[PDB]
Scaffold this active site. Structure first.
Site: not given
Ligand SMILES: N=C(N)c1cccc(C=O)c1
Ligand SMILES: [Ca+2]
Length: 223
Positions: A40, A57, A62, A84, A172, A174-175, A177-178
């Site tokens: 996703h 920063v 890096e 996924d 976890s 939003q952000g 993910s993955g």
């Molecule tokens: N609750 C979570 N673990 C999670 C993970 C990735 C996205 C989202 C939100 O749609 C929620």
């Molecule tokens: Ca950095």
């Protein structure tokens, strides 16, 4: 990550940030040339950022390497999020050291009750919105398949597991993910989905990596 803690710079050396002008997803480095992430998270023009702590920063450890190819799982369904998982190949091999390191793939699946480390630069609030600059960490147990299915009737497949806390407050988000779910030094999960974040009786749902090790290995072997 909601209800977690500051990991510490480069303490999670396999954690990558996927960048398309801005951080948009996590990933896990599995060898010098390959990253595992969520399907996703797929998009074109990905730059993989290794050795990151503060994503805003340049701190000195890096490595920024463009993706040469992405491979979404052949059976990924974007409606159900079944399967996924995606592989990303780097244009050049990462230089591996103590702060940029691969994570081992599992040789067997993990059990309910195992403690794991979940990490990412996602939202830290369950109601509001606040994005951290430095990497956040959460220690969380894998939950039983029965409790996972009970929490999300009709939605949990054999390629998913739940981890976290049914009471809420720690998850976890939003952000994230993955990104990785690592249990006893093995990559067992990928941050996939949930209903809101850190909500009561709505734990995190994770891609069950042990199911995909055969596909990962053979894909790497021919690409
Ligand atoms: N609750 C979570 N673990 C999670 C993970 C990735 C996205 C989202 C939100 O749609 C929620
Ligand atoms: Ca950095």
């Amino acid at each position: 990550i909601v209800g977690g803690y500051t990991c510490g710079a480069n303490t999670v050396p396999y954690q990558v940030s996927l960048n398309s002008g801005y951080h948009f997803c996590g990933g896990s480095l599995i060898n010098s040339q390959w990253v595992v992430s969520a399907a996703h998270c797929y998009k074109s023009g990905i730059q993989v950022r290794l050795g990151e702590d503060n994503i805003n920063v340049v701190e000195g450890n890096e490595q920024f390497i463009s993706a040469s190819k992405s491979i979404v799982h052949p059976s990924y369904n974007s409606n159900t999020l079944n399967n996924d998982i995606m592989l990303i190949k780097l244009k050049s091999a990462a230089s591996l050291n103590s702060r940029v390191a691969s994570i081992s793939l599992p040789t067997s699946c993990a059990s309910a009750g195992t403690q794991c480390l979940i990490s990412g630069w996602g939202n830290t609030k369950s109601s509001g919105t606040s994005y951290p600059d430095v990497l956040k960490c959460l220690k969380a147990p894998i939950l039983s398949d029965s409790s996972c299915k009970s929490a999300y009737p009709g939605q949990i497949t054999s390629n998913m597991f739940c981890a976290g806390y049914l009471e809420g407050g720690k998850d976890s988000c939003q952000g994230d993910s993955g990104g990785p779910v690592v249990c006893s030094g093995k990559l067992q999960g990928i941050v996939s989905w949930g209903s809101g974040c850190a909500q009561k009786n709505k734990p995190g749902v994770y891609t069950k990596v042990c199911n995909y090790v055969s596909w990962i290995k053979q894909t790497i072997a021919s690409n």
